[PDB]
Amino acid sequence: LWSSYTEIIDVKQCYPNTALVGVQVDSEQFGSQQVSRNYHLRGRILQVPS
Amino acid sequence: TETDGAVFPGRIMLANTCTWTYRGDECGYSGPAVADEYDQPTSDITKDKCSKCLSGCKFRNNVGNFGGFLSINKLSQ
Amino acid sequence: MTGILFSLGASMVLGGVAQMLAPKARTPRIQTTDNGKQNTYFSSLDNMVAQGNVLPVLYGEMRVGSRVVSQEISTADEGDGGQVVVIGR
Amino acid sequence: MGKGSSKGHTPREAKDNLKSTQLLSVIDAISEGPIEGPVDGLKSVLLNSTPVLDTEGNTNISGVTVVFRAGEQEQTPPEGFESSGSETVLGTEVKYDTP
Amino acid sequence: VPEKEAIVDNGAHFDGEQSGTVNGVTPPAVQHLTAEVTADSGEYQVLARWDTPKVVKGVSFLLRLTVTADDGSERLVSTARTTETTYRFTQLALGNYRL
Ligand code: SF4
Incomplete structure (x- = not known):
């Protein structure tokens, strides 16, 4: 059987000048509880002397 | 160098309003005059102003550089 | 072009000698909801709401929790991206 | 990986029965300016x-x-995230002779 | 300065809908609901399956089972709330049913 088909339009926003992370995870594993995302990052690229 | 009216982070995440300055470095738009500040079509360069709304940005086809973050108000609710 | 000139040493030292050489660091207010869990102004480990709040700035290596821009639940597609897909046993 | 942009994934175990799985899609806004990135990948x-x-x-x-x-x-x-979609219901059986 | 009243009253240009009821946060209907009556295990069982729709920020499910008597009255046999897309019913009676 062939049931239907969908034409999908993705996100078209670039989010300039912001550092963002997107996560897609199968949710049956964690059960009822919500997931709390924490990241271990470095931070701003500053301007230092030559 | 006085610090009376200044708050440091200074950039607000808004759901429907763009915080950039029009034709600035961050908006990155440079082209013919398109619309008014009330989303009315125009061609005179003197009275071309962005309304900071999503339609005002769509007039420029510059949706990519939109300052605000759409559909936050669904989550904040 | 007249007046009285005073000595500020006794007035300045009233707080402490240290405050004359360097300002004092700020401490967040105490809320009893935390059960004595103590907070600081330069760390945050949880995910906060977005609208009406500022975009944070990160200056050094640290564990971070970040404001949410989107969150949804849907049904996952069976295809894993390759040409071959096998459904079921 | 790269500094400007990156991608990673851990493979999902194959199912046994004919059951569907949920999927959680989250976007987080970490900081403002150009940041160097993760310390150790995933x-x-x-x-x-x-x-x-x-x-x-x-x-x-x-x-x-x-x-x-x-x-x-x-x-x-970001890749793989959707804004809207429209579907047209066919409901037509596929046979061997006529694709 | 009396001239500022007309400047204030003109307001601004707002984009969107005043009603804004096209898409709130009410979840849509579940996608594919099917009930299967199997005797493989030696008993009569009902296997209910559905597919999660696009729900914002978490979703859970509510199930009601109703016995449709011959008269036309519908009795409520049981109710359940679960977060798993599949549910099984056992030890049922002889009448018709609706999920
Ligand atoms: S709405 Fe679009 S065109 Fe107008 S200032 Fe913002 S980014 Fe620029």
Whole structure:
């Protein structure tokens, strides 16, 4: 059987000048509880002397 | 160098309003005059102003550089 | 072009000698909801709401929790991206 | 991986029965300016408090797909996220002779 | 300055809908609901399956089972709330049913 088909339009926003992370995870594993995302990052690229 | 009216982070995440300055470095738009500040079509360069709304940005086809973050108000609710 | 000139040493030292050489660091207010869990102004480990709040700035290596821009639940597609897909046993 | 943009994934275990699986799609706004990025790849991403990758290469959580965009003026929108879609219901049986 | 009243009253240009009821946060209907009556295990069982729709920020499910008597009255046999897309019913009676 062939049931239907969908034409999908993705996100078209670039989010300039912001550092963002997107996560897609199968949710049956964690059960009822919500997931709390924490990241271990470095931070701003500053301007230092030559 | 006085610090009376200044708050440091200074950039607000808004759901429907763009915080950039029009034709600035961050908006990155440079082209013919398109619309008014009330989303009315125009061609005179003197009275071309962005309304900071999503339609005002769509007039420029510059949706990519939109300052605000759409559909936050669904989550904040 | 007249007046009285005073000595500020006794007035300045009233707080402490240290405050004359360097300002004092700020401490967040105490809320009893935390059960004595103590907070600081330069760390945050949880995910906060977005609208009406500022975009944070990160200056050094640290564990971070970040404001949410989107969150949804849907049904996952069976295809894993390759040409071959096998459904079921 | 790269500094400007990155991608990673841990493979999902195959199912046995004919059952569907939910999927959680989250976007987080970490900081403002150009930041250097993760310290150790996927091991620096923590769900609840568990690293996605163990201290070694062994995986702790299977099925996670992470996209990292360091703050830049010119960057591409995150991949795999959708805004809207329209569907047309066919409901027509496929037979051998007529595709 | 009396001239500022007309400047204030003109307001601004707002984009969107005043009603804004096209898409709130009410979840849509579940996608594919099917009930299967199997005697493989030696008993009569009902296997209910559905597919999660696009729900914002978490979703859970509510199930009601109703016995449709011959008269036309519908009795309520049981109710359940679960977060798993599949549910099984056992030890049922002889009448018709609706989920
Ligand atoms: S709405 Fe679009 S065109 Fe107008 S200032 Fe913002 S980014 Fe620029």
